[PDB]
Amino acid sequence: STVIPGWFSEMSPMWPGEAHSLKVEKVLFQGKSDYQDVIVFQSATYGKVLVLDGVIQLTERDECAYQEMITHLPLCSIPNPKKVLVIGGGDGGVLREVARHASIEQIDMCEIDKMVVDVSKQFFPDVAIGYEDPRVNLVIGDGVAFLKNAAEGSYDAVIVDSSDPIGPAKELFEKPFFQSVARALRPGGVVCTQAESLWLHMDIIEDIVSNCREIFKGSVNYAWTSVPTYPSGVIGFMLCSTEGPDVDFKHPLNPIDESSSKSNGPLKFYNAEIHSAAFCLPSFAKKVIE
């Protein structure tokens, strides 16, 4: 066969037999750091694209879906979060999403790979803005260690913007991590972590539900969302709360209506209907995840 040139194709064994492609406009930077083969390129129709170890880490055109999601789903499910921990901010947009919340005192943007943080701040504009927030506390270092040596009940929310459980990052999906997460969460605190796709990782996702269930006394839930530039297009999330005040993940307490940010910036892919709808899972998975 003959392959038409000019295209970038996302391929993984984690999603075999299929691939999402993007016409590359211009190469902006590729390098294998100590942790990952990083890449930043200008696509044809999706703008700038960040790729880590092969997997499209994010896209400008639809970053709002993941960012607003992984962030606001848990942040709007609890009253006035003040101290929030962010692990894996491979861009700073998730961080930007946080700044929308006025009650936020400080965020511990804990990222480990500096090639990324650097390459993100340069090429990505509205993305590099996050790190700039005053309340932000950036720290280049390991994440699992950061959470072990973490004070007890100091955080209001834990957001794991991790990648996939392929190599040493598999910890962030195992029980030793979830227990390390809960330790840092105060009673009633919440954690949100991406949990792969329903069309491709039932088994994996299922283990994650069992794990979170055997660690959180609160209400562990799985909500999914739409994001085109992701594998299959339906990446999910785990929402868990610790023993303490009840947390209704299905009905945000302080949902960002739109004006609840007004002069800050317009919400692109989030509102009160999406937050609840997000949870409605398909039958085939509904029975399993329960």
User: Which one is catalytic: 62, 133, 156, 161?
Assistant: 161
Q: Is 67 annotated as a binding residue?
A: yes
- Complete DSSP assignment for 161-205: ----SSSGGGGGGSHHHHHHHHHHEEEEEEEEEEEEETTT-HHHH
The sign of the torsion formed by the CA atoms of 38, 41, 47, 48 equals: positive
For 70, the token pair is: 């992984």
> Which contiguous run of DSSP H or E holds residue 49?
strand 48-52
For 201, the token pair is: 């990782």
Q: Is 1 annotated as a binding residue?
A: no
- Is 203 noted as a catalytic residue in this protein? no
Q: Is 203 annotated as a binding residue?
A: no
Q: Which is nearer to its own copies, 181 or 235 (CB)?
A: 235
Q: Is 161 annotated as a binding residue?
A: yes
Q: Which is nearer to its own copies, 152 or 258 (CB)?
A: 258
Q: Is 118 annotated as a binding residue?
A: no
The sign of the torsion formed by the CA atoms of 92, 93, 98, 100 equals: positive
Q: Which is nearer to its own copies, 27 or 253 (CB)?
A: 27
Which residues fall within 8 angstroms of residue 254, CB to CB, at 6 or more apart? 76, 79, 80, 260
Q: Which is nearer to its own copies, 62 or 156 (CB)?
A: 62
CB of 31: closest distance to its own copies in angstroms?
4
Q: Where are the alpha helices (DSSP H) in 219-282?
A: 272-279
Q: What are phi and psi of 116, to 5 degrees?
A: -65, -65
Q: Closest Cα partner for 130 from 192, 86, 164?
A: 86
- Nearest-angstrom CA–CA distance, 232 and 24: 20
CB of 241: closest distance to its own copies in angstroms?
21
Q: Which is nearer to its own copies, 1 or 149 (CB)?
A: 1
Q: Is 218 annotated as a binding residue?
A: no
CB of 58: closest distance to its own copies in angstroms?
15
Binding-site sequence positions for S-adenosyl 3-(methylsulfanyl)propylamine: 36, 67, 91, 111, 142-143, 161
Binding-site sequence positions for putrescine: 66, 161-164, 230
Q: Catalogue the active-site residues.
A: 161
Binding-site sequence positions: 36, 66-67, 91, 111, 142-143, 161-164, 230
